[PDB]
Amino acid sequence: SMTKTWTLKKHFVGYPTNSDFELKTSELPPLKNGEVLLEALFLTVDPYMRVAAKRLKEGDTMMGQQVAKVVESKNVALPKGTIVLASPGWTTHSISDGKDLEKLLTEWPDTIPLSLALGTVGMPGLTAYFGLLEICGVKGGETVMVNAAAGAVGSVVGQIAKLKGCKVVGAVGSDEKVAYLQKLGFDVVFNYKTVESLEETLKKASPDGYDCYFDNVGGEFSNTVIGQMKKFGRIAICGAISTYNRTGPLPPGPPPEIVIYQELRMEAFVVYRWQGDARQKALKDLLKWVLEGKIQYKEYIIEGFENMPAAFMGMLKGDNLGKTIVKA
Amino acid sequence: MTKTWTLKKHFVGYPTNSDFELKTSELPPLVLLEALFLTVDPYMRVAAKRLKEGDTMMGQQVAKVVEVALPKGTIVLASPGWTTHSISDGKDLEKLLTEWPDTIPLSLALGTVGMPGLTAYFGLLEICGVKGGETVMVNAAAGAVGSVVGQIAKLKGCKVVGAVGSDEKVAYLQKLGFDVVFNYKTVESLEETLKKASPDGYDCYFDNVGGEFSNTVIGQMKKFGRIAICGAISTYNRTGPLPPGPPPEIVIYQELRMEAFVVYRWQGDARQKALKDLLKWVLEGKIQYKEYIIEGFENMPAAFMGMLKGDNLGKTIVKA
Ligand SMILES: [Cl-]
Ligand SMILES: [Cl-]
Numbered sequence: 343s344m345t346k347t348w349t350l351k352k353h354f355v356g357y358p359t360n361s362d363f364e365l366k367t368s369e370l371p372p373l374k375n376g377e378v379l380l381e382a383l384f385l386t387v388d389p390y391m392r393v394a395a396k397r398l399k400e401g402d403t404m405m406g407q408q409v410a411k412v413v414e415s416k417n418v419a420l421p422k423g424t425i426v427l428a429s430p431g432w433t434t435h436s437i438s439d440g441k442d443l444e445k446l447l448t449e450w451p452d453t454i455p456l457s458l459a460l461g462t463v464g465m466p467g468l469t470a471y472f473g474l475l476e477i478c479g480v481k482g483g484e485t486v487m488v489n490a491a492a493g494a495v496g497s498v499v500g501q502i503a504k505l506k507g508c509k510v511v512g513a514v515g516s517d518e519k520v521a522y523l524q525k526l527g528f529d530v531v532f533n534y535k536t537v538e539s540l541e542e543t544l545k546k547a548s549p550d551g552y553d554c555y556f557d558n559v560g561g562e563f564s565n566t567v568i569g570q571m572k573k574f575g576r577i578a579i580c581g582a583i584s585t586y587n588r589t590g591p592l593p594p595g596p597p598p599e600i601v602i603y604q605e606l607r608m609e610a611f612v613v614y615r616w617q618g619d620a621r622q623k624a625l626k627d628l629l630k631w632v633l634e635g636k637i638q639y640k641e642y643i644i645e646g647f648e649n650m651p652a653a654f655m656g657m658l659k660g661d662n663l664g665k666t667i668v669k670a
Numbered sequence: 671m672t673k674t675w676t677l678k679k680h681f682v683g684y685p686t687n688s689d690f691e692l693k694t695s696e697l698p699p700l701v702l703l704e705a706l707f708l709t710v711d712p713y714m715r716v717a718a719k720r721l722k723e724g725d726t727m728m729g730q731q732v733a734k735v736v737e738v739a740l741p742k743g744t745i746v747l748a749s750p751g752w753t754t755h756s757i758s759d760g761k762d763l764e765k766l767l768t769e770w771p772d773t774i775p776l777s778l779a780l781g782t783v784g785m786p787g788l789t790a791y792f793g794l795l796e797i798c799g800v801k802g803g804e805t806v807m808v809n810a811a812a813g814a815v816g817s818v819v820g821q822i823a824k825l826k827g828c829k830v831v832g833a834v835g836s837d838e839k840v841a842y843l844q845k846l847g848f849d850v851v852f853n854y855k856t857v858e859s860l861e862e863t864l865k866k867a868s869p870d871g872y873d874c875y876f877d878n879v880g881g882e883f884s885n886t887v888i889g890q891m892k893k894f895g896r897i898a899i900c901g902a903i904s905t906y907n908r909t910g911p912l913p914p915g916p917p918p919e920i921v922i923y924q925e926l927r928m929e930a931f932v933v934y935r936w937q938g939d940a941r942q943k944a945l946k947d948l949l950k951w952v953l954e955g956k957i958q959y960k961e962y963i964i965e966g967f968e969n970m971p972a973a974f975m976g977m978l979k980g981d982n983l984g985k986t987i988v989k990a
């Protein structure tokens with residue numbers, strides 16, 4: 343057997359470039375009893391990988407999740423053809439003993455793409471689900487500010503908020519994303535790169551301020567939003583993508599006087615905090631909302647394992663509309 | 671007649687004497703309140719920016735009536751600003767605790783058994799949510815709030831690491847029983863000092879200072895660590911832009927919870943019970959108090975500036 347794997351040739355300086363990755367071919371050992379050989383069907387690239395890569399040794403495999411098919415099996419629980427979620431990194435083939443896999447929902451229908459298990463009905467959707475419903479604690483009727491609102495996480499945040507009865511103000515990085523989310527029904531959507539002044543745009547979008555802030559971006563953008571949070575406003579700190587590729591010092595922080603006077607609550611979280619029955623129920627809620635049309639999905643499918651570095655870099659620069667997925 | 675301190679000129683950096691102006695005024699006929707003790711507090715540096723030039727500096731005081739619910743001689747807490755005399759209709763006053771003993775200074779109603787002590791109580795017990803066994807980082811630890819925070823933490827069963835601005839404050843807090851105390855102005859490296867003070871990190875952070883100091887503390891917070899954002903004094907008297915924010919990757923990876931608060935959020939039975947607790951702990955010796963008494967209403971600006979620069983040990987109080 344053989345496998346193709348993407349490794350970190352060099353730690354990223356600023357945004358990644360092609361020279362930071364190295365494609366290597368490896369010979370897999372044969373199966374031992376209780377193991378299976380997994381062939382990747384869909385592999386995800388996600389913003390967190392820019393940060394997690396700093397913990398790698400140079401030469402290590404890039405981390406990441408994938409939907410995979412069993413092609414050979416010495417384990418009866420996983421017959422040839424079983425579909426699983428695995429995280430062996432950017433690799434076409436891998437060997438697993440079975441304890442590091444997750445079977446898809448038993449109720450998974452064939453009317454929606456399998457790749458949604460890496461998106462709206464997978465890790466990004468769960469991040470939106472718990473970030474908004476638990477960390478932000480929306481009950482209905484709130485005004486919610488979400489940035490990267492067309493990304494894998496933000497798009498789910500806005501649509502869950504809408505089905506809960508919230509007003510949604512979304513910030514995105516391109517006109518095409520603005521038009522898409524406006525057609526979905528978000529109350530206000532704008533391109534942060536082209537606004538004449540961010541402060542006036544946010545003020546007009548909600549004169550009374552914002553109850554909740556789902557933050558994927560960080561940086562100066564968040565300083566402006568903090569200046570328009572209502573008293574006791576809740577901020578879910580999910581990501582800081584505007585800073586991940588920074589080469590210089592971080593931008594100034596928010597004005598402390600505003601944070602204190604408004605008594606803001608700001609909590610950071612990672613989706614893996616929730617496991618067991620909480621995680622499983624969130625997945626079923628996301629599945630039902632998708633099947634009812636309450637949550638639309640959009641994917642940017644890229645063909646070819648060899649193009650995975652390009653998919654990752656394009657995703658970081660915001661060039662793709664929809665969850666970026668690499669189809670092997 | 672009455673004496674009043676006004677904001678002659680908005681502060682640039684730390685205040686100076688020329689930024690204040692003492693004015694004499696004639697009070698109208700009617701209760702008349704004469705100030706015995708007036709407090710100066712860090713929050714005034716920030717609140718002063720909202721003032722118009724010529725306005726009275728804001729502040730609280732203990733006062734006694736000099737001229738029916740308020741007979742001549744009643745002691746009250748009032749906030750007419752930096753003024754020796756003021757007129758009140760009675761609805762903006764608070765009678766002291768009915769059980770207030772005469773064995774402790776009246777001026778403690780502006781301190782450990784007053785607004786600063788309540789800030790420590792709710793910031794640590796509710797916002798930080800200490801239950802016992804936590805390692806708590808507190809800065810400005812010898813100030814009115816911080817000193818109460820550390821002593822409440824100790825009586826709750828916490829380890830306390832305190833940062834102060836002078837060697838005299840280090841010795842005082844060590845005598846109070848803080849596990850670790852250091853002078854941030856003279857430490858070779860804040861990161862190394864905090865790391866040895868608690869190799870395992872910090873469960874809670876009572877933050878009165880902000881700025882780069884807090885960025886370093888955030889890098890040593892444990893997972894699910896709780897931060898109570900009480901003040902940002904290092905940024906109050908600042909020239910130039912605010913310092914960079916904390917590293918987002920650390921905040922997210924450690925899933926930190928950071929909530930800001932102001933003491934006035936709690937009223938009614940919560941506030942009364944907190945006052946009752948603070949007084950009881952003082953009478954039991956679990957919370958020691960210390961005051962820096964400055965004689966003369968004319969010296970109130972000097973008391974405020976010295977307090978901001980960390981020159982005063984104990985709650986800064988101006989006795990008229
Ligand atoms: Cl976006
Ligand atoms: Cl994506």
Ligand SMILES: [Cl-]
Binds near residue numbers: 809810811833839980
């Ligand atoms: Cl101090």
